[PDB]
Design a protein around this ligand. Structure first.
Ligand SMILES: *[C@@H]1O[C@H](CO[C@@H]2O[C@@H](C)[C@@H](O)[C@@H](O)[C@@H]2O)[C@@H](O[C@@H]2O[C@H](CO)[C@@H](O[C@@H]3O[C@H](CO[C@H]4O[C@H](CO)[C@@H](O)[C@H](O)[C@@H]4O)[C@@H](O)[C@H](O)[C@@H]3O)[C@H](O)[C@H]2NC(C)=O)[C@H](O)[C@H]1NC(C)=O
Ligand SMILES: *[C@@H]1O[C@H](CO[C@@H]2O[C@@H](C)[C@@H](O)[C@@H](O)[C@@H]2O)[C@@H](O[C@@H]2O[C@H](CO)[C@@H](O)[C@H](O)[C@H]2NC(C)=O)[C@H](O)[C@H]1NC(C)=O
Ligand SMILES: *[C@@H]1O[C@H](CO[C@@H]2O[C@@H](C)[C@@H](O)[C@@H](O)[C@@H]2O)[C@@H](O[C@@H]2O[C@H](CO)[C@@H](O)[C@H](O)[C@H]2NC(C)=O)[C@H](O)[C@H]1NC(C)=O
Ligand SMILES: *[C@@H]1O[C@H](CO)[C@@H](O[C@@H]2O[C@H](CO)[C@@H](O)[C@H](O)[C@H]2NC(C)=O)[C@H](O)[C@H]1NC(C)=O
Ligand SMILES: *[C@@H]1O[C@H](CO)[C@@H](O)[C@H](O)[C@H]1NC(C)=O
Ligand SMILES: *[C@@H]1O[C@H](CO)[C@@H](O)[C@H](O)[C@H]1NC(C)=O
Ligand SMILES: *[C@H]1O[C@H](CO)[C@@H](O)[C@H](O)[C@@H]1O
Ligand SMILES: *[C@H]1O[C@H](CO)[C@@H](O)[C@H](O)[C@@H]1O
Ligand SMILES: *[C@H]1O[C@H](CO)[C@@H](O)[C@H](O)[C@@H]1O
Ligand SMILES: *[C@H]1O[C@H](CO)[C@@H](O)[C@H](O)[C@@H]1O
Ligand SMILES: [Ca+2]
Ligand SMILES: [Ca+2]
Ligand SMILES: [Ca+2]
Ligand SMILES: [Ca+2]
Ligand SMILES: [Ca+2]
Ligand SMILES: [Ca+2]
Ligand SMILES: [Ca+2]
Ligand SMILES: [Ca+2]
Ligand SMILES: [Ca+2]
Ligand SMILES: [Ca+2]
Ligand SMILES: [Ca+2]
Ligand SMILES: [Ca+2]
Ligand SMILES: [Ca+2]
Ligand SMILES: [Ca+2]
Ligand SMILES: [Ca+2]
Ligand SMILES: [Ca+2]
Ligand SMILES: [Ca+2]
Ligand SMILES: [Ca+2]
Ligand SMILES: [Ca+2]
Ligand SMILES: [Ca+2]
Lengths: 420, 413
């Protein structure tokens, strides 16, 4: 009766001699019969030599998986009535490295990810047992610690990693990242395996449109021809796709009239004339544009284009009699006798509305006397005794200071009570 | 032969555990060295092993799955025996919480999915008689849920889950019951009340009673006259629900000169003289904001419509007065001067009627809008005057009316 305890590395060569029962147990000298055995396909003893040998190669991972202890039993009988209990352990060697399901994974991370957020990653697997199994994961974060790593265990004592966002992300600062996750096992020959993580930084609508300048001032000549270009506004959004697709439109509080007068093309941003711009109607107008991106929760942006009109001499002067005497002027009417009161006007402004008026001949004896703003008195010029005329067809002329100028005329008749 | 017994805990005092004599095949028993002198003893002359007191497996072996007591007795003629008896667990304990009520402070702003710690329970019993799981009683339409998670040992702990959003303004407090259940065929349970105070987050804007108002006031109204008392309400708590009034960013300065709004009441009152002729009606754009963080503004608009009073007498102005001396035989109707009358008021208050002092020989003849010609009335002779002090009178149609006069002198040559 004798126990024997062996222990042998895995991946032994087929036909490797494990032991010598006869010599190790101190039996005689002969016959070595096998009573029973855990694995007949793996271990056998030569009947006439007492040598215990491997029948095939032995992969401890295929036999005992992760078990810390891995044993094979064998019960032999020796020459002439002596029994031996052989038990041999198969030791683990670090002949396997941790392995990932791929060499590269790809993920979709929005730049809106809050710092601290954590993201799944594929775990690695080491079939080796004990100290030769999975030890930990480690990251190679190239972007000065933008990404971190969290390592957590599960019930069986195996670990899995997860990505951490240690500081915020910004697509518009870096669109893509690539960082390498490695898995390390224990054992004196440390086995490792790596995987590249290729992360797409998704766009979040975090940029407002921006007009080249908040305010503009544009001069246009009044009565400008339809379709005249007013201005091409340009707004830019640094986001992607629709988040960075600008749409222009008239603000809510631009008056209807202005909407009648101008047309803005929604995609170009071109403001062009749509109606006749009368200076006498309105000196200058305000066009309040707004631009918005076509993303969700869109960000509006306001701009202000002041159109300042230029007055052109497009109104001739008008003449209007407030009161006129009749046809009965006395021969001896003193110089300065009032004959009529008149107004002259010009809707234009500046030189275009600057008037100068005169009588057709005064050769007839009448003077025009300007008393008030746009108010003239036509009176008698001379005594009506030497150059006496039976009837007069007085005609007033008004002339503005335009380029070119404009003039209008208007007549009335008067008689003298001359020969009686 | 050793003797191996196994007996439930909390046995009756003096319960017979075993019979040494029969089990070990011996003869009729002194105790040499036993594990527990107070728990088990053997009757000297019968060989019977009995309990001396109760056995609480929890007090002896705590959570240990196996719980054993040794005992060494002998019998006549050097008959040595090894007795060993295991104590089985029974579910004589329920899970227990450190209290019967917890209270929590959860803000209504808590994101759905958020989870909150809760106190765990403890069962002293062993194995299947220990803590099994927790269960919640959420009475308010499944407002809150429960997550149960294991620890390194295999012990479980609960935490509250917010499965959908909360709203203080809809329900200020909640109370829900968390119970812990153990295994064992008599299933033991123990409960704890969670009293959760729902904190306010500034999630309500102020609200004016109406977006727009229209108020009439008489021009030149006396200082301090009340224009309107605005009222805005915020349904939030504390500063989050504290209304503050102010004039909007885009109301012209002049209006700011004309009106005063009290920041806390919301009372808009007159601060300057309201001249109708300056501006017929004005717009006062008020805003109310709560005193919480990221405050929510709200806009209201009060249009002040003025009423015109006859506060402008009529003004007279000579456009032309010719010379200071007319012709002796000037025909009736000779123009002597052109004059204009005006009144800054509107309506009847600005409706004028004018006349000359006499008919002296001068008429007033209105030719155009607010334009009159003073002419000679009749033929100039048979009179004791050389120069005339002509005086014009204008009279408006106010209540009461107003009148102004203005004179000029002319001579006869
Ligand atoms: C909005 O963005 C446009 C385009 O973006 C530019 O692209 C190039 C130039 C880059 O280098 C950047 O600098 C810019 O962002 C800016 O440029 C306008 O482009 C339009 C589109 O082509 C131009 O319109 C052209 O006008 C030509 C006629 O030129 C006239 O002006 C000269 C100067 O005196 C004058 O001598 C001539 O006789 C004409 O009167 C015409 O031949 C062509 O077909 C086309 O119509 C436009 O001219 C450019 N800007 C301006 C102000 O003219 C814009 O700068 C930007 N908007 C604004 C308001 O700045
Ligand atoms: C803003 O509120 C004031 C006063 O508030 C009132 O408070 C209570 C006394 C009760 O009357 C509540 O209904 C009110 O909110 C208003 O001033 C009063 O208005 C009521 C009209 O129902 C009138 O009978 C009173 O004479 C007013 N003055 C008082 C009570 O001193 C005011 O009208 C409110 N503003 C607006 C725009 O509605
Ligand atoms: C021209 O006459 C007016 C009016 O004076 C008199 O008014 C009545 C009493 C009547 O008797 C008329 O015949 C008179 O002409 C003078 O203007 C006002 O005169 C009063 C004194 O009577 C004086 O208190 C006022 O201040 C004067 N002005 C006004 C606006 O009332 C005026 O002075 C006379 N002379 C000239 C050059 O105009
Ligand atoms: C308008 O005319 C009336 C009279 O025609 C003037 O009335 C007088 O006003 C004084 C005060 O200035 C009173 O003391 C008198 O009793 C009034 N007299 C009469 C007869 O009513 C009044 O002054 C004129 N208005 C202006 C601005 O001159
Ligand atoms: C008066 O003169 C104007 C301008 O020459 C002329 O048009 C008009 O016919 C004349 N009047 C008469 C009655 O001929
Ligand atoms: C005035 O207008 C008339 C229009 O018939 C024109 O013939 C004349 O040349 C003009 N005169 C001046 C000075 O502009
Ligand atoms: C892990 O580390 C080893 C070095 O021990 C490398 O050989 C391997 O490629 C992996 O990077
Ligand atoms: C980690 O490193 C290995 C080198 O052994 C690569 O093959 C792998 O793609 C990852 O970069
Ligand atoms: C836990 O469950 C028991 C029944 O198993 C109840 O009786 C007890 O009140 C508690 O709710
Ligand atoms: C659970 O039951 C206990 C009583 O045992 C209470 O503390 C609680 O109110 C809940 O009903
Ligand atoms: Ca192997
Ligand atoms: Ca390994
Ligand atoms: Ca191995
Ligand atoms: Ca960004
Ligand atoms: Ca972005
Ligand atoms: Ca954008
Ligand atoms: Ca453009
Ligand atoms: Ca015009
Ligand atoms: Ca013009
Ligand atoms: Ca003109
Ligand atoms: Ca007990
Ligand atoms: Ca229990
Ligand atoms: Ca128990
Ligand atoms: Ca709320
Ligand atoms: Ca709230
Ligand atoms: Ca109020
Ligand atoms: Ca609020
Ligand atoms: Ca006034
Ligand atoms: Ca008035
Ligand atoms: Ca008046």
């Amino acid at each position: 009766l004798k126990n024997l305890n062996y222990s042998v590395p895995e991946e032994q060569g087929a036909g490797t001699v494990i032991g010598n029962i006869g010599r190790d147990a101190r039996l005689q000298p002969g016959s070595y019969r096998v009573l029973e055995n855990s694995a007949p396909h793996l271990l056998d003893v030569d009947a006439d030599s007492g040598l215990l040998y491997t029948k095939q190669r032995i992969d401890r991972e295929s036999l005992c998986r992760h078990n810390a202890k891995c044993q094979l039993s064998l019960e032999v009988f020796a020459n002439d009535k002596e029994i031996c209990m052989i038990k041999v352990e198969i030791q683990d060697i670090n002949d396997n490295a941790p392995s990932f399901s791929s060499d590269q994974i790809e993920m979709d991370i929005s730049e809106n990810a809050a710092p601290g957020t954590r993201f799944p990653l594929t775990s690695a697997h080491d079939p080796d047992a004990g100290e030769n199994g999975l030890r930990t994961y480690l990251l190679t974060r190239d972007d000065h610690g933008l990404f971190g790593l969290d390592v957590k265990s599960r019930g069986d004592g195996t670990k899995f990693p997860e990505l951490v966002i240690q500081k915020a992300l910004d697509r518009e600062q870096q669109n893509h990242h690539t960082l390498v996750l490695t898995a390390l096992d224990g054992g004196e020959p440390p086995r490792s395996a790596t995987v590249q993580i290729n992360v797409k930084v998704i766009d979040s609508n975090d940029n407002s449109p921006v007009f080249e300048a908040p305010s503009y001032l544009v001069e246009l000549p009044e009565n400008a021809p339809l379709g005249t270009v007013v201005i091409d506004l340009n707004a830019t959004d640094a986001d992607e796709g629709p988040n960075g697709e600008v749409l222009y439109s008239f603000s809510s509080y631009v008056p209807d009239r202005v909407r009648e007068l101008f047309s803005i093309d929604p995609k170009t941003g071109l403001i062009r004339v749509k109606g006749n711009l009368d200076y006498e109607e309105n000196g200058m107008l305000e066009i309040d544009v707004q631009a918005r991106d076509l993303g969700p929760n869109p960000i509006p942006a306001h701009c202000k284009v002041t159109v300042k009109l230029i007055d052109r001499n497009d109104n001739a002067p008008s003449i209007g009699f407030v009161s006129v005497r009749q046809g009965a002027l006395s021969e001896a009417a003193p110089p300065g006798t009032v004959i009529a009161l008149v107004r002259v006007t010009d809707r234009d402004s500046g030189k275009n509305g600057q008037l100068q008026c005169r009588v057709l001949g005064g050769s007839v004896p009448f003077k025009l006397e300007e008393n008030y703003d746009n108010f003239y008195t036509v009176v008698t010029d001379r005594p009506l005794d030497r150059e006496t005329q039976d009837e007069y067809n007085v005609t007033i002329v008004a002339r503005d200071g335009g380029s070119p100028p404009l003039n209008s005329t208007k007549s009335f008749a008067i008689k003298i009570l001359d020969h009686h």
